[PDB]
């Protein structure tokens, strides 16, 4: 049930809603009003997915797929068997996600720590809403959102990207891939460092952070520090996702042509625009 040091922390209080009505655990899980909320949404949406599984005539996971309304219904409602189910599931999905975040907030208040976690979560939720809600409403049709299927949604990606040629050419999609690639390099090193310090050569004394900072100077000439590196990772992460919601919010809205052609503004610059030779002309 409890971790050896858990009891002193399980005091009452912290809840945003319901006072103490739902202030209590269930095994290791904390509940709280929002814990109920998310349960409600999560269950409901699962039922609907099962319902959708019948209309499609299959219970196979690699096949089930709740597609959104066809483009003809614009942003209006649609029949259950033809996009309606997706719209309701999207709602439960979002209801579940918000409740979950708000749940971490209560868990935050009870433990007396900072709200960085829930806060960071919200960025993920945001990326999700971009793809299923903001981009579609801005393109006037639920049909632009992605389908809920293991591979079908992968298709949505493939096709959506190729609709504009090599999507690699999306400037914001380029910045995003940078934070993603970086976050992992960063992550790989932070863990490698801390561990190499707490697990020195066999028989040696547990190194100190001073050895950690030394190692990075002896190597690259600079060391961001124990607090900095934790600041850095959070940043890279959220950045990579921020540039990801961006890159898509613009695709199909402000810009709907080939992504490669967007790069001509550069080459057309008067100065080099007409010069002969080189790659362009």
């Amino acid at each position: 049930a409890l971790l050896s040091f858990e009891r002193k922390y399980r005091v009452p209080g912290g809840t945003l809603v319901g006072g103490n009505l739902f202030d209590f655990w269930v095994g290791p899980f904390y509940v709280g009003f929002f814990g109920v909320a998310t349960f409600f949404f999560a269950a409901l949406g699962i039922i609907l997915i099962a319902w959708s599984a019948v209309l499609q005539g299959t219970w196979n996971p690699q096949l089930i797929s709740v597609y959104p309304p066809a483009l003809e219904y614009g942003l209006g409602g649609a029949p259950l068997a033809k996009g309606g189910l997706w719209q309701i599931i999207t709602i439960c999905a979002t209801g579940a996600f918000v409740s979950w975040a708000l749940r971490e907030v209560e868990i935050c208040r009870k433990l007396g720590i900072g709200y960085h976690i829930p806060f960071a979560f919200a960025f993920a939720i945001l990326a999700y809403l971009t793809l299923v809600l903001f981009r579609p409403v801005m393109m006037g049709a639920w049909g632009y959102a992605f389908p809920y299927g293991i591979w079908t949604h992968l298709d949505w990606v493939s096709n959506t990207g190729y609709t504009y040629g090599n999507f690699h050419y999306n400037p914001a999609h380029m910045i995003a891939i940078s934070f993603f690639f970086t976050n992992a390099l960063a992550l790989a090193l932070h863990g490698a460092l801390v561990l190499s310090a707490a697990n020195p050569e066999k028989g040696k004394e547990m190194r100190t952070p001073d050895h950690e900072d030394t190692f990075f100077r002896d190597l690259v000439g600079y060391s961001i520090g124990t607090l900095g590196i934790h600041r850095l990772g959070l940043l890279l992460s959220l950045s990579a996702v921020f540039f990801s919601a961006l890159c898509m919010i613009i695709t199909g809205t402000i810009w709907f042509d080939q992504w490669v052609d967007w790069w001509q503004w550069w080459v057309k610059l008067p100065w080099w625009a007409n010069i002969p030779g080189g790659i362009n002309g």
Binding site: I229, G277, G278
Partner: protein, 302 residues
């Protein structure tokens, strides 16, 4: 507002830190460079010293060579005209020898011979730099986690341009040094092998890449959340657990049923990331050599 600790409210400076010594040959450490109020807002403000030493020079040199070898070719293409250079910067490119030359080292400069050279330097610069990360660890009595991690990355890099091209038969199969150039290569690789999505290792790799951002985002926020109990001082909390380590663990326990320890989380961390280039390396290595179309393969698995 309630101070979020993303930035320091006040900086503080003291003398330059020459760093721990151990079995390090101090004859090689450079000089304590300046400080930086800018950087000092986010993390450390002290710049340097750096331990150069033999191997470091080899790479640093062997590295610039690779970099210039390419910059030159770009000029050759730029027609030496600086405006052309700047304009078509992202467009230039140094491609590898034509299929004909196969795996021979006979191709002439303007046929992949130049690519071969640059590649050579690269191959030295990186590998030498790898040993450097192993020694700097060793001179301080630290584990070699960093060397083994950097290796996983070398794996993929080593597969993309050295292994697979050799198993295929030519220097053609490798990646061209160029910005937009190497982006197309990628898009192409996919198309030619029947859509990489159908490649299991690929879908796996992505999984971890996503995992890394998920995890680092989690780990990062947690630590700042309990930095009011001196949480960032991870090593000590590992030696002698404090409230920072307890509240940190409990927040997750209550949220998702389980949790980690101040020394365990970093073990997740290093593996989550490392696997990204571990799994990816495999997927690319099989592509072309064993499997030809992942779609077709995805149909029977034989």
């Amino acid at each position: 507002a309630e101070y979020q600790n993303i930035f320091s409210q006040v900086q503080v400076r003291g003398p330059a830190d020459l760093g721990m010594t151990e079995d390090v040959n101090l004859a090689n450490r450079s000089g304590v460079g300046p400080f930086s109020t800018l950087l000092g807002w986010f993390g450390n403000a002290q710049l340097g010293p750096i331990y150069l030493g033999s191997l470091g020079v080899l790479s640093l040199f062997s590295g610039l060579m690779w970099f210039f070898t390419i910059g030159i070719w770009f000029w050759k293409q730029a027609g030496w005209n600086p405006a052309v250079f700047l304009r078509d910067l992202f467009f230039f490119s140094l491609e590898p020898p034509a299929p004909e030359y196969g795996l021979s080292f006979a191709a002439p400069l303007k046929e992949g011979g130049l690519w071969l050279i640059a590649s050579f330097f690269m191959f030295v610069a990186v590998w030498s730099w790898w040993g450097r990360t192993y020694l700097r660890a060793q001179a301080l009595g630290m584990g070699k986690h960093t060397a083994w991690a950097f290796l996983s990355a070398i794996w993929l890099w080593m597969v993309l341009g050295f292994i697979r091209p050799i198993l295929m038969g030519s220097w053609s199969e490798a990646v061209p040094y160029g910005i937009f150039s190497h982006l197309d290569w990628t898009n192409n690789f996919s198309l030619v092998h029947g859509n990489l999505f159908y490649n299991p290792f690929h879908g796996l790799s992505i999984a971890f890449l996503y995992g890394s951002a998920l995890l680092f985002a989690m780990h990062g926020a947690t630590i700042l959340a309990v930095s009011r109990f001196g949480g960032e001082r991870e090593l000590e909390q590992i030696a002698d657990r404090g409230t920072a380590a307890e509240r940190a663990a409990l927040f997750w326990r209550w949220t998702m049923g389980f949790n980690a320890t101040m020394e365990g989380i970093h073990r997740w961390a290093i593996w989550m990331a490392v696997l990204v280039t571990l799994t990816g390396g495999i997927g690319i290595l099989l592509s072309g050599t064993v499997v030809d179309n992942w779609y077709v393969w995805g149909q029977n698995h034989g």
